[PDB]
Amino acid sequence: TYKLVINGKTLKGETTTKAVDAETAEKAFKQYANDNGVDGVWTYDDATKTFTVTE
């Protein structure tokens, strides 16, 4: 796999993670964003297995 794109005011980038289901990921990404001081709106496309955080 899944991809996460971070569109922040000060931080812009991308990271990846391996998980057995989408739910498990979401949780991992939520933790990552927090550790980096980023807070926003989350979007996810099942077709591309990508989550986007804007912010």
UniProtKB/Swiss-Prot annotation:
It is found in: Secreted, Cell wall. It comes from the Bacteria. This is Immunoglobulin G-binding protein G. Binds to the constant Fc region of IgG with high affinity. The chain holds residues 298 to 352 of 448 of the full protein. Sequence repeats lie at residues 1-55.
